[PDB]
Design a protein around this ligand. Structure first.
Ligand SMILES: [Zn+2]
Ligand SMILES: [Zn+2]
Ligand SMILES: [Zn+2]
Ligand SMILES: [Zn+2]
Ligand SMILES: [Zn+2]
Ligand SMILES: [Zn+2]
Length: 233
């Protein structure tokens, strides 16, 4: 259980409006999340997530989210990105942030009077995967391989970030990455822990586009998707 925290995602904004119960409960499941990280189709979840506990489709804006950028950045700027993992929901695995460099695809997700179709949700996903923000594009950032993967498997990739080993002796799982304190970010079930990295924004402008976060579970056949509305100008 987890969701994108910084920049503030649609999921975080919905929680701030008080119209949800469980921001960390937005899940693409049951699916094959491992070791092939991109195989599972996103279905209703899309690039922004659907929260089936609270019946909220983050892919469609409201006045609370998706109708404006939450933060404006410059092309190529290195930025902090952070997600929140639930104390009782630390599944380990790998995660990534993506920007779809096709404004016309993204625009389907920016209209509060429009619900993107399942077809549009998957085409957006494929556009996001072409627009993955690699860990390796930030000079000085350590981009390791997963202790739960071996060379030769589809999880052997350091464009994605990795959580620490699920059975790691020291600082296991996702919480191990920042090793922060409990309630360093909000989750509803058992309190949250931050998971923090940097990415380099593409050399690309948009007055309103999306960063899509995807966390692929190691322990469970589950994917967690969120998105944040940004500008790159
Ligand atoms: Zn979970
Ligand atoms: Zn809430
Ligand atoms: Zn994908
Ligand atoms: Zn694949
Ligand atoms: Zn504990
Ligand atoms: Zn286009």
């Amino acid at each position: 259980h987890g969701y994108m925290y910084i920049p503030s995602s649609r999921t975080r904004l919905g929680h701030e409006a008080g119209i949800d119960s469980c921001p960390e409960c937005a899940i693409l499941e049951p699916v094959s999340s491992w070791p092939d990280l991109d195989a599972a189709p996103v279905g209703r979840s899309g690039p922004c997530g659907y929260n089936a506990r609270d019946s909220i489709d983050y892919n469609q804006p409201t006045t609370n989210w998706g109708s404006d950028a939450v933060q404006s950045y410059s092309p190529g700027e290195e930025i902090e990105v952070q997600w929140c993992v639930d104390h009782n929901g630390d599944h380990g695995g790998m995660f990534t942030y993506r920007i779809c460099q096709d404004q016309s695809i993204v625009d389907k997700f920016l209209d509060p009077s429009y619900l993107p179709t399942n077809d549009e949700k998957q085409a957006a996903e494929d556009c996001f995967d072409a627009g993955l923000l690699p860990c390796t594009d930030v000079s000085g950032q350590e981009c390791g391989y997963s202790a739960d993967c071996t060379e030769g498997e589809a999880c052997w990739r350091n464009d994605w970030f990795t959580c620490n080993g699920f059975e790691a002796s020291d600082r296991p799982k996702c919480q191990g990455v920042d090793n922060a304190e409990l309630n360093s970010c909000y989750t509803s079930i058992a309190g949250g822990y931050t998971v923090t990295k940097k990415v380099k924004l593409p050399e690309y402008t948009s007055n309103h586009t999306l960063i899509s976060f995807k966390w692929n579970s190691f322990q469970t056949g589950q994917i967690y998707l969120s998105c944040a509305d940004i500008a790159i100008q």
